[PDB]
Amino acid sequence: FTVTVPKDLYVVEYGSNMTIECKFPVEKQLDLAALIVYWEMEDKNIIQFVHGEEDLKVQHSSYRQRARLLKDQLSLGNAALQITDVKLQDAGVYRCMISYGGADYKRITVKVNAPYNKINQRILVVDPVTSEHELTCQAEGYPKAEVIWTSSDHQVLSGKTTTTNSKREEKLFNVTSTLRINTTTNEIFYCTFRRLDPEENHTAELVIP
Amino acid sequence: VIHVTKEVKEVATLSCGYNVSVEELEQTRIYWQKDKKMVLTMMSGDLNIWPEYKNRTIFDITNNLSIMILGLRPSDEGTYECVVLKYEKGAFKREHLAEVTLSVKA
Ligand SMILES: *[C@@H]1O[C@H](CO[C@@H]2O[C@@H](C)[C@@H](O)[C@@H](O)[C@@H]2O)[C@@H](O)[C@H](O[C@@H]2O[C@H](CO)[C@@H](O)[C@H](O)[C@H]2NC(C)=O)[C@H]1NC(C)=O
Ligand SMILES: *[C@@H]1O[C@H](CO[C@@H]2O[C@@H](C)[C@@H](O)[C@@H](O)[C@@H]2O)[C@@H](O[C@@H]2O[C@H](CO)[C@@H](O)[C@H](O)[C@H]2NC(C)=O)[C@H](O)[C@H]1NC(C)=O
Ligand SMILES: *[C@@H]1O[C@H](CO)[C@@H](O)[C@H](O)[C@H]1NC(C)=O
Ligand SMILES: *[C@@H]1O[C@H](CO)[C@@H](O)[C@H](O)[C@H]1NC(C)=O
Ligand SMILES: *[C@@H]1O[C@H](CO)[C@@H](O)[C@H](O)[C@H]1NC(C)=O
């Protein structure tokens, strides 16, 4: 009896719905009474399915409401663990242990990527007599990122950046930056969320109405 | 001897307390047994799990020659013995003995 995995590594976007799979042999019908499936991540228990009975009390608190074993796949010889709304906390080494006419286990590494992809912007008129505007860019990601403001002609402009931890997940950062500039209509501005080694940049375009 | 306590419907991992490299397998004999009854034999690279242990036992060779028992039932409770024998010049000499008693509880 041999347990197999399609992917031994999953790289998942933060907030995504991820399903990691372990395949095991099934012949014609599935004897639910002879099936044992466990899903765990390092020291945390996720799934305990023995002889067609799933215990929920065994599941770790961090996974409640988000993790489930897709029992429809079991018929097809697939122990599929679905985790919805993936957190940074879900990064780690998963392991499935299966018993169905013999026993085996496989390990899956999961890496969670939290880019500053969803940039929220706000353009406000501070004083129309002097055409002063206040521009704001805010995004959450991991690790910390600096905000860089650039003019239409790509010259850097001084802003005020505040970095705190996200309320959604303690590891995640909430970075907000504000630029105050006397500017006219239809001008284009850029706010860049720079994160280092590996260097990754996320820029939002802001147009003054 | 180690007295391990586990719960019904859990997985028990009983360790041999001995790590063998893959190269050393060709000249090593591993014997896991429960209550003087054979469980599995790694005989110079050749694994053989006994019929009463095929369906629920895993042999993690890379992890201290441990045995994993999925879906613990009160039957699984008992004394387990792991033996190592390394071939040297003449024949196989005993290298290691591991004793571990499983207590499966409600
Ligand atoms: C990710 O999955 C979310 C949860 O889905 C539900 O609960 C799971 C535990 C599982 O049983 C699922 O099969 C089940 O649908 C889901 O809420 C989320 O959003 C879905 O997509 C739309 C919004 O983004 C919306 O139209 C759907 O109604 C919504 N699903 C539900 C049930 O509200 C899924 N998001 C992604 C990015 O896939
Ligand atoms: C050890 O497991 C075997 C495996 O049989 C199958 O296991 C699953 C894959 C599932 O599809 C089951 O429905 C199968 O039975 C057991 O062997 C079978 O046992 C039944 C009676 O219990 C018998 O009618 C079958 O012919 C057996 N087939 C073979 C080839 O073994 C076996 O009973 C289990 N033994 C122990 C010690 O638990
Ligand atoms: C992120 O930061 C903004 C600005 O401080 C704040 O109003 C918002 O509630 C924060 N959101 C989270 C999820 O931390
Ligand atoms: C930008 O606006 C201020 C008024 O808010 C005005 O004095 C001037 O035109 C600009 N300030 C500077 C220092 O350029
Ligand atoms: C045994 O311990 C660990 C893994 O269990 C490993 O680093 C070490 O090299 C192992 N020893 C041998 C002989 O392989």
Author numbering:
A (entry chain B): 19 to 227
B (entry chain A): 35 to 140
The authors write:
The WT CD80 extracellular domain (ECD) is comprised of a membrane-proximal IgC domain and a distal IgV domain. To address this, here we utilize directed evolution to engineer a CD80 IgV domain with increased PD-L1 affinity and fuse this to an immunoglobulin Fc domain, creating a therapeutic (ALPN-202, davoceticept) capable of providing CD28 costimulation in a PD-L1-dependent fashion while also antagonizing PD-1 - PD-L1 and CTLA-4–CD80/CD86 interactions.
To better understand the PD-L1–CD80 interaction, we co-crystallized the CD80 IgV domain from ALPN-202 complexed with a PD-L1 ECD and solved a CD80:PD-L1 structure. PD-L1 binds CD80 on a surface that does not overlap with the CD28–CTLA-4 binding site. Atezolizumab contact residues on PD-L129 indicate that the ALPN-202 CD80 vIgD contacts PD-L1 at an overlapping epitope. Thus, simultaneous binding of both PD-L1 and CD28 is not only possible, it is a functionally active interaction.
